[PDB]
Amino acid sequence: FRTFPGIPKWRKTHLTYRIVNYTPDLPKDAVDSAVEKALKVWEEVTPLTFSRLYEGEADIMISFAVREHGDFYPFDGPGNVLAHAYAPGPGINGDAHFDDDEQWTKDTTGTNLFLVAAHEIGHSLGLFHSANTEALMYPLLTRFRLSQDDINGIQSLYGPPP
């Protein structure tokens, strides 16, 4: 596993998230479900806990965007970059943006929202890319399981569950 330079990590255990907008590709409940599941992946193996906001600034602001979207890193159309997320910290830090030029799906027929959200939330929590090909944090459904490498890395930052 890898962390970010200077090892930025959240200094508190309870983090908020907010789903700022919704893709046309999926029912809203499928977006909410995929996000909740993605957060749970990491909650299960650390002392981190999460709660959702519907107004104000949550630590992890989640949104869908296309091309230029209010930051220095425009998305690139279909394929290639699927989403991006910022390392822990204030403001834009922690936030996760999903390219709506992808076709987000609940299954594997398009780009699976849950898998990509789980990987991006890893970044939001302070893990950079792993060298292990089976890790969620490697740049790349019934068989999904967080790898030990991912657990080792997230626990290196936040410890194991109490």
Among Zn ion, Ca ion, none, what binds residue 71 when CB lies within 5 to 8 Å by partner kind? Zn ion
- As annotated, the binding site for Ca(2+) includes 25, 59, 76-77, 79, 81, 91, 93, 95, 99-100, 102
The burial of 34, by beta-carbon neighbours within 10 Å (0-12 exposed, 13-18 middle, 19 or more buried), is given as buried
- Least distance between Ca ion and beta carbon 111 (Å): 9
**Selected binder of Zn ion within 71, 78, 110, 148 (CB under 5 A):** 71
| Beta strands in the chain, from DSSP E residues, in sequence order | 14-19, 49-52, 60-65, 83-85, 96-99, 104-105, 111-112
Pair type for strands 96-99 and 83-85 = antiparallel
- Minimum gap (Å) between residue 149 Cβ and Ca ion: 26
Count of residues near Zn ion by CB under 5 A: 2
User: Looking up tokens 């997230």, which residue turns up?
Assistant: 154
From 36, 68, 120, 134, active-site residue: 120
Residue whose C-beta lies closest to Zn ion? 97
**Which residues are at the interface with Ca ion (CB under 5 A)?**
25, 76, 80-81, 94-95, 99-101
Is 43 labeled as catalytic in the residue annotation?
Answer: no
Q: Of 147, 65, 70, give the one whose Cα is nearest residue 98.
A: 65
- The amino acid sitting at 51 is S
Shortest Cβ 73–Zn ion spacing (Å): 5
Report the distance separating Cα 33 and Cα 36, nearest Å.
5
Nearest distance from C-beta of residue 8 to Ca ion, angstroms:
12
Q: Which of 97, 101, 121, 149 is the binder for Zn ion (CB under 5 A)?
A: 97
Return the closest-CA partner of residue 121 out of 150, 79, 152, 156. Answer: 150
Q: Is 18 in the site for Zn ion (CB under 5 A)?
A: no
* Residues of this chain that bind Zn ion (CB under 5 A): 71, 97
